[PDB]
Design a protein around this ligand. Structure first.
Ligand SMILES: CCCCCCCCCCCCCCCCCC(=O)OC[C@H](COP(=O)([O-])OCC(O)COP(=O)([O-])OC[C@@H](COC(=O)CCCCCCCCCCCCCCCCC)OC(=O)CCCCCCCCCCCCCCCCC)OC(=O)CCCCCCCCCCCCCCCCC
Ligand SMILES: CCCCCCCCCCCCCCCCCC(=O)OC[C@H](COP(=O)([O-])OCC(O)COP(=O)([O-])OC[C@@H](COC(=O)CCCCCCCCCCCCCCCCC)OC(=O)CCCCCCCCCCCCCCCCC)OC(=O)CCCCCCCCCCCCCCCCC
Ligand SMILES: CCCCCCCCCCCCCCCCCC(=O)OC[C@H](COP(=O)([O-])OCC(O)COP(=O)([O-])OC[C@@H](COC(=O)CCCCCCCCCCCCCCCCC)OC(=O)CCCCCCCCCCCCCCCCC)OC(=O)CCCCCCCCCCCCCCCCC
Ligand SMILES: CCCCCCCCCCCCCCCCCC(=O)OC[C@H](COP(=O)([O-])OCC(O)COP(=O)([O-])OC[C@@H](COC(=O)CCCCCCCCCCCCCCCCC)OC(=O)CCCCCCCCCCCCCCCCC)OC(=O)CCCCCCCCCCCCCCCCC
Ligand SMILES: CCCCCCCCCCCCCCCCCC(=O)OC[C@H](COP(=O)([O-])OCC[N+](C)(C)C)OC(=O)CCCCCCCCCCCCCCCCC
Ligand SMILES: CCCCCCCCCCCCCCCCCC(=O)OC[C@H](COP(=O)([O-])OCC[N+](C)(C)C)OC(=O)CCCCCCCCCCCCCCCCC
Ligand SMILES: CCCCCCCCCCCCCCCCCC(=O)OC[C@H](COP(=O)([O-])OCC[N+](C)(C)C)OC(=O)CCCCCCCCCCCCCCCCC
Ligand SMILES: CCCCCCCCCCCCCCCCCC(=O)OC[C@H](COP(=O)([O-])OCC[N+](C)(C)C)OC(=O)CCCCCCCCCCCCCCCCC
Lengths: 318, 207, 97, 242, 346, 171
């Protein structure tokens, strides 16, 4: 399988940057209401957890969607904080893709039919994602605070009208630029886990489906569904803890729980909610992951195949 | 030991199973002794007496809506209680049977994900066998492809010889007789290209 | 205070504010009108009154005028009978064939 | 779906809710008839108000609409057998379709013969009437029906007949014509059926014309002035000349 | 990579087998344009006929509530002429024709295109029957799911259009036609006004699509001995198969449309919590688990059958005529069907 | 007919069809005794229909092939059999679908989680007419309790008849 790779065309840095920015802008614009619903579902069950039983376990995404719509802001109410979300996502992708491209170009094998093993690429992707998430933690924090407010009491809300406005308010009120990096280690852990939980499961099932059913067209999409499931299983606890740390107010009075760090948040989640309290909003997180990944993979594959056909690559090399 | 998070009234995040509206398996005693059934009147048949009343006509089609009575919900197990009651203190508990009937081992239902696994058991078993074990062989379930031109050898796949046979006097006459179907492919460059009406996939590239 | 779950605390209220009507102002006005005028306001689909060649329906017509015979019925308590006495006569020819 | 506002839907919901609330099972009625004589109920507390033999007085076999179809059957069978039209294999079988569906109207007619009333009794209390009918194969059916279910039809049976003013009994008291009566809900053999039409044939004995007229006109008859006749004349499954 | 996941495309050496003609082989006419065109054509024709049928039936019922039903054939002809003369009938024809175009180009056409796209390549056995039809069960199912909510916005736009028509003058949107309402609703009440609480419509569309298409394809292949071994018309047989499939689809789709009646039309018990909590899905589950199957089939023909069944029947007939149910059958011994010709004739 | 597919059809009809249908009859007859809950009717009916149809469709063409001289244990056969063989294989897959439904109903039986009620109401035999009276009274009370929350005949007919609320022109 180490001879099985197909890297006869390597996109340049400009191509990867532009394509990533555009395609991921589209993907993030499509699934932002799903992310909003997931964050709200995680917020509403902080000290409570999952209290239903059997098939009712968890929080219904459609119920949260209906409540947020019945608020009265319509679908535009699901895109509040989208400026912060988009800027943070684009900055994270820029930094991660630049670092990954540099370290890959320094380390990729000579032969076009060879590539780094999933462990080496996983190390590179984890380092890149950790760095990019550490640098974009202020934007992620502003976005999560914008989403979380609304499911919180009036005196507990921050009232952010933008990304720069939120950053200025955080720096001025809480104090210092270290305030912008509240819960940044949680974001680093989430990005490290997310960057290693998707490439592994996808290639596994994709190649196994090929071995079983030959070269059909549904193989990559079934593998994408499987990879999305396993990435959601691995990443959701870290996303939950990051949401808890981001949404915590500076005043200890204005908090259902007070967390002094990542470990403290995990401990107080296990104490009050149990283990199953980590996986709240799993359906929303998995659906958003699958839709985002499908949109990105589909559009990127179309564009890159069009580029390859103009580069003279043969059909089996595309 | 009251936790409002476990209370369906205070905690609005506890979704209600409407099919278990009147049934609380937590309060089921073992053996069951509750009486939830009795005579029901004044729904369509009044409990009053109008047999000889000439000024009163009974119209049961005017029946009023009442609270729907759901089918009884089966008992749900209590893990700690069941483990404690069925636990035996080996070598210090007498091997005997208690006089009370509450010592009976009552069966209570439990989780449903196990039965989710059970429901897909035929699919999982057939998939396991045929796909996972790759039975009868690897190539059976794969999407069918013809071999490339003269692959692996002309002794097995004599595509060029058949192409020449169909394009000669004898081949043309045999096709004219109607007992032989027309040629199903064309050798363009060094590639065997099957016609659309042939109803087969194209051969895979020799990578 | 909070974290004492013997009594509910307002810090655990998962209630979202109501900024505006969910589906616009006219939807709310129609909902108010429905609340006030459910049953008092009855629109009537338009049918001409005096049409030549048609006998106006002054009263209900018997079952003698029915073109088709129902094979299903209703019990007086709402139960829907699928297996009715008409169904036996209807099933005789199919079973015979 | 419910967020769409329809005034007709709101009116329907209001009508259903108002009918559920205001309209009750127990309905007050003022249709009460007091007969001018003492009613002599039998040993079982019911007075026979109508008797007949509907099967004896009906044409069973040679009825016009159905003899036509049953006489057309041999023509289709012959057309299939000899194929005078030189049809293909499917068309002759299409010809053979007809004999399977030509006796069905006779089946419906013979079924209708069992909805002609054979006996009608008025039970004590004046609110229930027992109706006995018989099928063409000798099966006997009994149905207890409330008096208010009866709605007289006209002579032609095309339209409903006006209650409180209708003359289906002659001056003497016997039936003037074959009277059709519609029942809103008839429980036949344990299955409730809506809008069932029954017939009282002219060649039938109407005992107690007042009680028969009151039952047909949907009256609650006052049976306070009664006596009981201890006559054990009848037997179960008694022969009745069909 | 371009994001957290890399789609690792790989190269593989060739493989081949003895036979080539009974698995998935995509047909040459299965392009997106051709499937869309054929599905849209069949859908718009079937929908136009179905909506004209519905308008005629409901305007006949509207006239019959104010005039006596005809006694003989001449009175029936006069009644039909007066129904056609109705002002209410012509506007209904126009608006339901617009609705039929919308649901044919985007719902029935989409269903047909998706079914053909997913199921074009399933080839059939040469002189037998397609024994492995189970492979079509997931495939067809996917299509149904992928096309389940494609009719919901149009149906809810029609509902909103008529609801607007039935309100007082001061509380009217002034919708000139169905297309005007469809174009104006998403910018006045929002896009979610066309999707909120649409589980009955979605599951009804799912069952209609799956039952109709799967049953029709299965029967038109498995009941093929009726006109191949014992020579029958095959057109009467196709019509009978289409009727059976349509009846099964209508039977399996109706009970989910009763949830509307059960939830917000059945009178409520005062002072008691509302059953089903106004969800349509708790109601659907209760119907699924209800012991008496006749209670949720009341009004099957009054409310639903004659508003969907002719449309589904014509959809099947026209789809088969255009060619959306044709599958490739190739001899498995001679020619392209075999890679071991030496055992073909021995 | 010795050592031909006629024997295969005979004993497969018998064993598979009859024996497994009786086994399924016992499974549904003892479902509460075996599982503690009552079974679901929908997937049970689907299981019945598909299993029976599969048995017939799979084992009648085997009779046809046995009459034509088809030996039993040959994996290759004359070309003139394939037709019915295909039909036979089709039937088997139909049977398989029924099997799926079987397992589905078991899953569906544990989502449902209902307590089973015997249809006899405790009166298996009407040896006397008093038993018939007791059964009739209890049955009517049970059915009345079941038909609660389901509207009466008049309201139901009103809702069904007045369903259509889409008219273009009003007065
Ligand atoms: C039923 C009866 C019992 C089972 C019988 C099984 C019979 C078959 C069998 O054994 O086949 C051999 C088969 C291995 O052969 P194979 O199928 O060729 O595998 C390919 C290789 O793995 C080579 O492929 P691979 O190495 O690429 O596959 C692994 C790959 C692809 O794997 C997959 O796609 C599937 C698994 C993905 C998991 C990802 C999330 C993990 C989360 C935690 C889970 C715990 O997964 C990853 O790369 C993982 C990346 C993401 C996770 C990163 C680390 C964790 C992050 C933090 C998570 C925190 C979560 C909690 C909070 O399975 C086993 O050997 C396992 C047998 C287990 C049962 C027997 C031993 C019991 C011991 C007690
Ligand atoms: C080639 C064949 C070889 C056969 C022998 C090889 C060794 C065994 C291999 C297969 C192991 C699983 C067998 C399951 C079926 C047989 C046992 C049985 O009927 O138990 C009745 C017992 C009755 O439960 P219930 O009536 O629902 O409510 C009772 C309450 O739980 C309250 O009752 P409780 O207090 O007793 O509850 C304790 C326990 C219930 O206890 C069990 O579940 C015992 C399971 C081990 C049985 C060991 C004896 C050998 C049985 C072999 C049967 C042939 C294989 C069938 C499965 C093949 C595919 C794996 O339930 C739990 O702890 C809840 C979660 C259970 C998760 C699933 C079991 C682990 O459990 C079941 O019926 C559930 C299982 C039904 C089959 C579907 C799931 C199969 C396993 C999927 C993967 C799980 C990881
Ligand atoms: C291809 C070959 C297949 C072969 C199969 C096996 C053949 C033999 C056995 C027969 C099996 C027939 C097949 C099943 C039929 C249906 C079962 C049934 O109970 O139906 C009636 C049942 C309604 O009755 P119910 O609910 O039981 O009763 C309460 C009702 O209020 C209704 O209250 P009710 O009291 O008014 O009605 C009671 C109901 C009761 O229902 C039935 O009885 C159904 C079965 C009737 C046929 C029985 C044939 C027996 C043949 C025997 C041959 C000789 C041996 O009766 C009727 O509905 C009409 C009368 C039917 C005849 C009654 C007498 C039956 C036995 C006659 C023979 C007995 C003596 C034999 C003597 C032999 C001497 C040698 O259901 C329906 O009408 C509709 C069902 C619901 C559909 C919802 C669909 C939703 C969507 C999801 C679908 C599922 C998921 C998958 C989706 C995707 C699919 C692709
Ligand atoms: C798990 C699930 C398992 C499911 C297994 C299968 C279950 C099947 C039944 C499930 C549902 C049962 C309940 C139900 O349907 O309730 C509704 C309905 C009650 O609704 P409703 O609210 O009372 O209706 C209001 C109406 O005002 C009053 O309505 P009604 O009470 O008078 O009832 C009407 C009913 C009354 O019908 C009967 O009673 C029929 C006689 C049944 C006898 C008993 C069964 C004998 C079976 C023998 C063999 C098996 C043993 O009429 C029909 O059934 C007619 C169906 C026509 C279908 C047409 C489909 C094609 C459309 C296009 C046609 C034009 C094609 C050419 C176009 C050319 C253009 C160029 O049911 C009934 O009243 C009857 C109960 C069931 C009777 C037997 C059902 C099977 C017969 C099927 C016949 C058609 C087959 C296909 C023919 C295709 C020809 C092309
Ligand atoms: C900065 C922090 C970087 C941490 C990087 C950890 C290793 C990479 C992530 C795991 C991964 O992608 O595994 C794929 C690899 C894929 O295997 P591979 O890399 O040998 O390539 C696949 C080869 N085939 C499929 C042909 C056999 O999977 C494993 O190694 C599975 C076992 C380990 C899985 C868990 C590793 C956790 C490490 C600590 C995380 C914290
Ligand atoms: C670790 C503990 C076991 C896994 C979590 C179990 C649990 O309660 O999950 C609830 C959550 C609930 O998800 P949810 O919070 O999105 O709610 C959707 C669920 N409904 C709609 C039914 C209310 O379910 C999962 O996480 C399922 C996947 C489990 C993955 C790990 C195995
Ligand atoms: C560690 C856990 C391991 C678990 C085991 C491995 C995974 C098991 C779960 C698999 C889930 C199902 C995936 C199906 C994907 C199908 C995609 C596709 O188009 O496949 C084409 C294949 C082949 O279709 P075909 O007819 O073109 O191919 C026949 C072979 N040739 C090419 C020579 C003509 O379709 C199928 O296999 C049918 C799948 C239907 C769904 C049921 C799947 C399970 C049963 C499969 C065996 C066949 C019997 C089916 C009937 C009985 C079912 C009980
Ligand atoms: C599955 C889709 C099938 C479609 C089939 C074909 C349909 C054809 C007819 C379509 C009709 C509707 C077209 C609307 C086009 C846009 C119109 C417009 O600009 O409207 C103004 C609206 C904004 O107005 P508004 O919503 O504020 O409404 C104004 C009116 N008030 C305020 C009174 C309510 O524009 C948008 O909403 C566009 C922003 C992008 C929306 C993206 C939605 C993504 C949803 C993801 C899934 C749901 C969340 C997750 C839930 C589950 C979680 C697990």
């Amino acid at each position: 399988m180490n001879y099985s790779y197909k890297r006869y065309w390597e996109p340049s840095t400009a191509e990867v940057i532009g394509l990533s920015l555009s395609v991921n802008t589209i993907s993030a614009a499509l699934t932002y209401p799903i992310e909003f619903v997931k964050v709200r579902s995680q917020i509403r069950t902080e000290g409570v957890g999952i209290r239903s039983k059997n098939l009712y376990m968890g929080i219904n995404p459609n119920k949260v969607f209906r409540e947020i719509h019945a608020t009265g802001n319509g679908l535009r109410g699901f895109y509040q904080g989208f400026e912060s979300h988009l800027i943070g996502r684009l900055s994270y992708l820029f930094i991660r893709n630049l670092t990954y491209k540099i370290i890959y170009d320094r380390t990729k094998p000579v032969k076009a039919h060879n590539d780094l093993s999933h462990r080496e690429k996983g190390v590179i992707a984890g380092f890149a994602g950790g760095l990019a998430a550490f640098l974009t933690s202020p934007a992620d924090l502003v976005n999560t605070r914008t989403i979380a407010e609304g499911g919180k009491p009036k005196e507990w809300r921050w009232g952010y009208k933008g990304l720069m406005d939120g950053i200025n308010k955080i720096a001025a009120t809480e104090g210092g630029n270290a305030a912008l990096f509240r819960g940044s280690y949680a974001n680093v852990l989430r990005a490290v886990i997310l960057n290693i939980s998707l490439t592994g499961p996808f290639d596994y099932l994709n190649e196994k489906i090929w071995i079983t059913f030959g070269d059909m067209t549904w193989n990559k999409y079934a593998a994408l569904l499987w990879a999305s499931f396993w990435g959601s299983v691995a990443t959701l606890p870290f996303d939950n803890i990051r949401t808890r740390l981001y949404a915590q107010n500076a005043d200890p009075t204005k908090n259902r729980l007070t967390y002094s760090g990542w470990a403290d948040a995990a401990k107080k989640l296990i104490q009050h909610e149990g283990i199953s309290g980590f996986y709240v909003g799993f359906y929303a997180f998995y659906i958003r992951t699958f839709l985002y990944a499908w949109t990105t993979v589909f559009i990127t594959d179309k564009i890159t195949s069009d580029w390859k056909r103009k580069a003279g690559l043969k059909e089996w090399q595309i | 030991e009251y936790d409002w998070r476990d209370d369906p009234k205070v905690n609005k995040d506890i979704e209600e199973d409407i099919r278990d509206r009147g049934w609380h398996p937590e309060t089921y005693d073992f053996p069951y002794t509750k009486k939830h059934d009795d005579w029901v009147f004044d729904v369509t048949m009044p409990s009053q007496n109008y047999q000889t009343d000439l000024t009163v006509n009974i119209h049961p089609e005017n029946k009023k809506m009442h609270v729907m009575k759901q089918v009884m919900r089966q008992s749900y197990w209590d893990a700690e209680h069941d483990m404690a009651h069925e636990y035996d203190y080996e070598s210090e508990d007498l091997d005997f049977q208690c006089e009370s009937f509450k010592s009976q081992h009552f069966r209570k239902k439990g989780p449903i994900s196990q039965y989710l696994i059970l429901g897909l058991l035929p699919i999982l078993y057939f998939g396991t066998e045929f796909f996972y074990n790759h039975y009868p062989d690897e190539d059976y379930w794969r999407v069918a492809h013809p071999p490339p031109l003269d692959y692996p050898d002309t002794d097995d796949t004599d595509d060029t010889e058949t192409f020449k046979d169909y394009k000669s006097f004898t081949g043309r006459r045999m096709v004219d007789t109607g007992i032989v179907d027309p040629l199903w492919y064309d050798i363009r460059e060094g590639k065997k290209v099957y016609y659309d009406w042939a109803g087969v996939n194209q051969p895979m590239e020799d990578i | 205070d909070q974290l004492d779950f013997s009594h509910f605390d307002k810090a655990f209220e998962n209630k979202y504010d109501i900024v505006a009507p969910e589906f616009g102002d006219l939807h709310q006005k129609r909902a108010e009108f429905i609340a006030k005028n459910q049953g008092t306001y009855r629109p009537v689909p338009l049918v001409p009154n005096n049409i030549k060649g048609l006998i106006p329906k002054t009263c209900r017509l018997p079952a003698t005028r029915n073109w088709y015979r129902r094979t299903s019925s209703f019990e007086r308590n709402g139960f829907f009978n699928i297996h009715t006495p008409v169904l036996n006569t209807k099933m005789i020819p199919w079973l015979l064939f | 779906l419910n967020h769409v506002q329809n005034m007709l839907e709101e009116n329907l919901k209001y009508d259903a809710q108002k009918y559920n609330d205001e309209v009750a099972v127990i309905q007050k009625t003022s249709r009460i008839y007091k007969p001018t004589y003492t009613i002599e109920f039998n040993r079982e507390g019911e007075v026979l108000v109508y008797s007949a033999d509907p099967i004896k007085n009906s044409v069973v076999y040679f009825k016009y609409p159905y003899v036509l179809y049953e006489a057309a059957i041999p023509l289709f069978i012959w057309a299939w057998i000899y194929n005078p039209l030189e049809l293909s294999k499917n068309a002759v079988n299409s010809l053979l379709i007809y004999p399977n569906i030509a006796w069905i109207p006779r089946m419906w007619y013979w079924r209708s013969l069992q909805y002609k009333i054979q006996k009608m009794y008025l039970l004590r209390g004046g609110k229930v009437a027992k109706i006995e009918t018989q099928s063409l194969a000798g099966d006997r059916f009994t149905s207890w029906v409330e008096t208010y279910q009866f709605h007289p039809l006209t002579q032609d049976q095309k339209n409903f007949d006006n209650q409180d003013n209708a003359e289906f009994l002659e001056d003497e008291g016997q039936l003037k014509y074959e009277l059709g009566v519609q029942l809103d809900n008839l429980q036949e053999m344990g299955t409730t059926s809506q809008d069932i039409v029954i017939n009282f044939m002219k060649e039938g004995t109407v005992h107690h014309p007042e009680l028969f007229e009151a039952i047909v006109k949907g009256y609650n008859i006052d049976t306070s002035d009664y006596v009981i006749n201890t006559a054990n004349n009848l037997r179960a499954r008694e022969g009745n000349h069909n | 990579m371009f994001f957290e996941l890399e789609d690792i495309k790989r190269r593989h050496s060739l493989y081949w087998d003895i036979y080539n003609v009974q698995g998935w082989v995509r047909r040459p006419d299965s392009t997106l344009y051709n499937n869309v065109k054929r599905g849209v054509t069949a859908g718009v024709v079937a929908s136009l006929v179905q909506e004209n049928i519905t308008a005629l039936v409901e305007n006949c019922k509207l006239l019959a509530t104010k005039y006596e039903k005809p006694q003989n054939l001449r009175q029936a002809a006069t009644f039909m002429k007066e129904v056609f003369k109705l002002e209410n009938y012509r506007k209904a024809v126009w608006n339901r024709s617009q609705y039929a175009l919308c649901i044919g180009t985007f719902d029935i056409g989409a269903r047909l295109a998706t079914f053909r796209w997913l199921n074009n390549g399933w080839q059939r056995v040469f002189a037998g029957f397609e024994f492995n039809f189970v492979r079509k069960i997931p495939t067809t199912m996917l299509a149904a799911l992928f096309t389940a909510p494609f009719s919901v916005p149009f149906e809810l736009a029609r509902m909103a259009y008529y609801g607007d028509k039935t309100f007082p003058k001061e509380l009217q949107r002034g919708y000139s036609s169905y297309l005007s309402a469809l174009a104006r609703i998403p910018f006045e009440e929002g896009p979610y006004f066309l999707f909120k609480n649409s589980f009955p419509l979605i599951i009804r569309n799912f069952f209609q699509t799956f039952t109709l298409f799967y049953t029709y394809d299965f029967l038109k292949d498995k009941a093929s001995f009726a006109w191949r071994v014992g020579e029958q018309n095959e057109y009467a047989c196709k019509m009978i198969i289409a009727g059976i499939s349509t009846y099964l689809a209508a039977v399996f789709s109706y009970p989910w449309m009763v949830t509307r009646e059960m939830v917000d039309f059945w009178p409520k018990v005062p002072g008691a919590p509302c059953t089903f909590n106004g969800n349509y899905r708790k109601a659907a589950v209760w119907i699924w688990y209800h012991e008496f199957s006749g209670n949720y089939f009341a009004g099957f023909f009054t409310k639903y059958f004659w508003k969907a069944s002719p449309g589904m029947f014509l959809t099947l007939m026209l789809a088969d005529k255009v060619g959306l149910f044709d599958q490739t059958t190739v001899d498995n011994f001679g020619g392209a069907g075999n890679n071991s010709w030496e055992d073909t004739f021995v | 007919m010795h050592d031909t597919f006629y024997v295969v059809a005979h004993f497969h009809i018998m064993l598979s069809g009859a024996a497994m249908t009786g086994i399924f009859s016992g499974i549904y007859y003892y479902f509460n005794a075996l599982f503690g809950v009552k079974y679901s009717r929908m997937f049970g009916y689907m299981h019945l229909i598909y299993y029976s149809g599969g048995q017939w469709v799979a084992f009648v063409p085997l009779f046809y092939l046995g009459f034509s001289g088809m030996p039993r244990r040959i994996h290759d056969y004359p070309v003139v059999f394939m037709g019915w063989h295909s039909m036979s294989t089709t039937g088997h897959f139909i049977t398989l679908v029924g099997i799926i439904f079987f397992f589905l109903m078991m899953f569906d039986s544990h989502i449902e989680r209902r307590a089973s009620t015997s249809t006899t109401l405790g009166l298996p035999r009407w040896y006397k007419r008093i038993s018939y009276y007791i059964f009739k009274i209890r049955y009517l009370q049970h059915t009345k309790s079941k038909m609660n929350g389901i509207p009466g005949s008049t309201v139901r007919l009103m809702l069904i008849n007045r369903h259509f609320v889409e008219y273009e022109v009003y007065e």
